[PDB]
Curated annotation (Swiss-Prot):
May have an additional translation initiation. Translation initiation at the first Met codon would generate a form that contains the signal peptide, enters the endomembrane system, and ultimately reaches the food vacuole. Initiation of translation at an internal Met codon would result in a form that lacks the signal peptide, thereby re-directing the protein to the cytosol. A nuclear localization signal would then lead to nuclear import. Belongs to the peptidase M1 family. One of its GO terms (molecular function) is zinc ion binding. The chain holds residues 196 to 1084 of 1085 of the full protein. This is Aminopeptidase N. The record marks Q597, L598 as: Cleavage. It comes from Plasmodium falciparum (isolate 3D7). A peptide binds at E124, G265, A266, E268. Inhibited by 1,10-phenanthroline, EDTA and bestatin. Inhibited by (Benzyl)Tyr-Ala (BTA). Activity is not affected by phosphoramidin, PMSF, leupeptin, iodoacetamide or pepstatin. Its EC number is 3.4.11.-. The keyword Signal applies. It comes from the Eukaryota. GO terms for biological process: proteolysis.
Length: 886
């Protein structure tokens, strides 16, 4: 079970200059012929020629057109092909092979596989070795010449990288196409697509060189009308990279292709981007609102890969966060600019602090550049991606737009790349910014190597006579398995000072640079005692301990200029309340109290929520955040041995407290919001997307949920009327909130009928049901399995049925262990054909050692059971071994 170590990087003792591919697709098999024009590198030392090759059936292999003999000249064990050096040339030579593979039965969705009636490849990170023999690593750059052949009736559209240079008919109702792609590339950027594809197209003229770029977006014929928004998003992405970064698209054509079966959101390949259908396809009638932001970010994401994917080659997979973190950052900038809503940034923060923080304090914790790996398929984490992006984002916060853009330019021009190369580039901008060639970003590198979430805490002092304000800051990171001693990080703290009398900014834009374990920042000429507005925009990926009173937090919530600090101040008020009530419920349970008291929710806090809700000029998206308690996975980072039942009771009490005061306000707003929220003026305009309007629907649907849970008088009338809405976000909401009423299975049937004839819509429906707050939710899942899901191997179907259920605090964590047992059964069943998705379904277990003693034991027993499965994949095993600290 080999472990790859970052310190042991060494260049290959070979070179592959040219790849010449012949991929012949047949009904029961695919024949791949490959000729590799190879050479010997300056690092060679007489070693064996070892190719990666997984699951390949050899017809023959050769060197210089002379067939090799097994046992004497080469061995193959279904993973590595070893050709003994004595039979390996010492100058330029040709290696060739013919193998048979079977996309029809490739249910792991890696390498070459069939999705519905489309043949498609997925080669990142190590899928190309599943197609043909290769030195399957990201620093092996080569030229590609690829011919594809297939039955013309079944596969009329043939696509691969580069230019289609030839099309030819073949005897037997077959045809062929040849694609030459001269620029060098890594093999994980190789792609091939074949199918009965329909497309929308457009021409984009670039800003500077005025070159015409053809844009194609493909799907199966049935869903071709759902492709327009994706096309628009692509236009948007090209324009943004132009305007913000000055980068034009390098090529003359861009293809986006949607497939039904895909392990992740999408995959960039040079000129040919392949997508999960749920991240490319949408219509107003058959998609929930969330799809539109999702497609925008994913299309944008794969697009921003393009310019840097050229010019910059990863030395090795340990530099993944440099590729992925930078792109997520660019994607985030794009999305914030395109949506123009503050909830876009908030939603990314909400994601980081729930999911990634949980990961970073779990046994799976790793830095964004890990020191080792067993399975590359487990390397693609929220830590590598989302903490990666926040570390990439901090460079911008530190430098500002002008110098950031200068540093980014340096990085591209100057540059195989490492995270250090990016740092060095940004460092040069840093020097120029501070006009001090002695200035450096050496400490910043700790963001790449140090695991765990730093804690930043504050103390304050105001001297009224001196007009002098001080902010005392402390940072620390808890030791973990990756570092016994944690060093202080370079932490940029974006701050303002709010005058509590009139809500005005008291100082200009200021970013404190914390570089020590602690420091004191002093401000003179501060006329009155301020309320500090800290980590504006969430300027560092840290736990913030603001040490503010709730009165101060309320004042920030009402009057601060920064959306994140307002939202965080709200969050912190909620957390103080949750921790207090949790401990009160816990003591009552422990001590078997017959009676006890609960601390009520702060009344001025409830007044502040009402104030903001009733402000017609305030933002609807932001409003939906303030009436929602913090995520369970955020809360859990703050509680030891969490009793999920006691947390459930805590949330219930707090929601009830606030509703008992504000429900009439909620109902009034739910009604007055209807006209603008559900405005149908542009319903049939496929390209008109209004993110403010979708936020209004989010607010209405949030309020509807609060009112339904509270059994507000006659709310069922509003629920039934809601189900008749043309918007899936609304009529799917009507389903889940109807859970608290007798009419649930009525709406269950109605919404099923609406959903069943669209594959993606059906999956949203499954999700809605899966997350329904039903006491009979286990019986309901069983129904979904037997009637809808069955033995589907579509990752979308499986994740749709089970993942939302796992977020059901009271039910998934049922003390019998029944929920853990159920998901472990699904994981083990899935792992037989798709280990990557099996690992995805482990996600609820990631917090196992944070729970109360009994639930820890239950989760651990189920993981140990999974670990005991004789046929467990290497993927699942490694992951569960790390998670259970074994
Ligand atoms: C959601 C998004 C767009 C941020 O990421 C993806 O949809 N896919 C990423 C990616 O970087 N696409 O360019 C992704 C995630 C995992 C993998 N992967 C995981 C194992 C092997 N490959 C590949 C790509
Ligand atoms: Zn990416």
């Amino acid at each position: 079970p080999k472990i790859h170590y970052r310190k042991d990087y060494k260049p290959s003792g070979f070179i592959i200059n040219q790849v010449t591919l012949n991929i012949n697709i047949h009904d029961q098999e695919t024949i791949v012929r490959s000729v590799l024009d190879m050479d010997i590198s300056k690092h060679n030392v007489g070693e064996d020629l070892v190719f990666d090759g997984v699951g390949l059936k050899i017809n023959e292999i050769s060197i210089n057109n002379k067939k090799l003999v097994e046992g004497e000249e080469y061995t193959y064990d279904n993973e590595f092909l070893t050709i003994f050096s004595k039979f390996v040339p010492k100058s330029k030579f040709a290696f060739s092979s013919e193998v048979i593979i079977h996309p029809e039965t490739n249910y792991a969705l890696t390498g070459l596989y069939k999705s519905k009636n489309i043949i498609v490849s997925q080669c990142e990170a190590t899928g190309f070795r599943r197609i043909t023999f290769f030195i399957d690593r990201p620093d092996m750059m080569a030229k590609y010449d690829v011919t594809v052949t297939a039955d013309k009736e079944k596969y009329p559209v043939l696509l691969s990288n580069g230019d289609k240079v030839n099309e030819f008919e073949i005897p037997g109702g077959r045809h062929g196409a040849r694609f030459n792609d001269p620029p060098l590339k890594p093999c994980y950027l190789f792609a091939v697509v074949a199918g009965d594809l329909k497309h929308l197209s457009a021409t984009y003229i670039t800003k500077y060189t005025k070159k015409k770029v053809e844009l194609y977006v493909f799907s199966e014929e049935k869903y071709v009308s759902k492709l327009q928004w994706a096309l628009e998003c692509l236009k948007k992405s090209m324009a943004f990279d132009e305007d913000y970064f000055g980068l034009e698209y390098d090529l003359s054509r861009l293809n986006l292709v949607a497939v039904s079966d895909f392990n992740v959101g999408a995959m960039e390949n040079k000129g040919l981007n392949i997508f999960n259908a749920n991240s490319l396809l949408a219509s107003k009638k058959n998609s929930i609102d969330f799809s539109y932001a999702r497609i925008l970010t994913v299309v944008g994401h794969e697009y921003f890969h393009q310019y840097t994917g050229n010019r910059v080659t990863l030395r090795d997979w340990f530099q993944l966060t440099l590729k992925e973190g930078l792109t997520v950052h660019r994607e985030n900038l794009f999305s914030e600019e395109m949506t123009k809503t503050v909830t876009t940034r908030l939603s990314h923060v909400d994601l980081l602090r729930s999911v990634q923080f949980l990961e970073d304090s779990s046994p799976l914790s790793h830095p964004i550049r890990p020191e080792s790996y067993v399975s590359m398929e487990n390397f693609y984490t929220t830590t590598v991606y989302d903490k990666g992006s926040e570390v990439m984002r901090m460079y911008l916060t530190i430098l500002g737009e002008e110098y950031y853009k200068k540093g980014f330019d340096i990085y591209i021009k100057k540059n195989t790349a490492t995270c250090e190369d990016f740092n060095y580039a940004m460092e040069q901008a840093y020097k120029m910014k501070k006009a001090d060639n002695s200035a450096n970003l050496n400490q910043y590198l700790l963001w790449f190597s140090q695991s765990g979430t730093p804690h930043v805490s504050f103390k304050y002092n105001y001297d009224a006579e001196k007009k002098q304000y001080s902010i005392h800051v402390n940072q620390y990171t808890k030791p973990d398995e990756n570092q016994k001693e944690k060093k202080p990080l370079f932490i940029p703290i974006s701050v303002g000072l709010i005058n509590p009398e009139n809500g005005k900014e008291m100082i200009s834009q200021t970013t404190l640079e914390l570089t020590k374990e602690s420091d004191t920042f002093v401000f003179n000429n501060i006329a009155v005692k301020p309320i500090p507005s800290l980590f504006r925009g969430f300027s560092a990926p840290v736990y913030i301990e603001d040490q503010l009173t709730d009165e101060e937090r309320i004042l920030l919530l009402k009057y601060d200029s920064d959306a994140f600090v307002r939202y965080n101040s709200c969050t912190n008020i909620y957390m103080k309340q949750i921790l207090m009530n949790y401990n009160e419920f816990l003591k009552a349970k422990n001590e078997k109290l017959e009676s006890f008291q609960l601390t009520p929710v702060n009344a001025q806090f409830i007044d502040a929520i009402k104030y903001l809700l009733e402000d017609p000029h305030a933002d609807a998206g932001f409003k939906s955040y303030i009436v929602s308690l913090p995520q369970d996975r955020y809360i859990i980072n703050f509680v030891s041995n969490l009793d999920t039942d006691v947390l459930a009771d805590t949330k219930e009490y707090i929601y009830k407290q606030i509703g008992d005061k504000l429900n009439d306000v909620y109902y009034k707003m739910f009604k007055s919001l209807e006209a603008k929220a559900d405005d149908l003026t542009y319903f049939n305009d496929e390209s008109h997307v209004d993110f403010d309007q979708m936020n209004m629907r989010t607010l209405r649907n949030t309020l509807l949920s609060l009112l339904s849970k509270a059994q507000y008088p006659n709310i069922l009338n509003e629920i039934i009327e809601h189900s008749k809405s043309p918007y899936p976000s609304n009529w799917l909401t009507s389903l889940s909130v109807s859970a608290y009423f007798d009419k649930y299975f009525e709406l269950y049937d109605k919404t099923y009928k609406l959903s069943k004839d669209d594959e993606l819509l059906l999956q949203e429906w499954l999700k809605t049901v899966s997350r329904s707050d039903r006491k009979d939710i286990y019986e309901i899942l069983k129904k979904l399995e037997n009637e809808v899901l069955k033995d589907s191997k579509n990752p979308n179907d499986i994740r749709a049925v089970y993942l939302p259920f796992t977020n059901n605090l009271r039910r998934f964590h049922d003390i019998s262990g029944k929920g853990y047992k159920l998901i472990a059964e699904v994981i083990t069943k899935t792992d037989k054909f798709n280990p990557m998705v099996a690992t995805q379904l482990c996600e609820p277990f990631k917090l196992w050692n944070k729970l109360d003693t009994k639930r820890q034991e239950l989760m651990l027993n189920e993981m140990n059971t999974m670990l005991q499965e004789p046929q467990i994949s290497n993927n699942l095993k490694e992951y569960l071994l790390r998670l259970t600290n074994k």
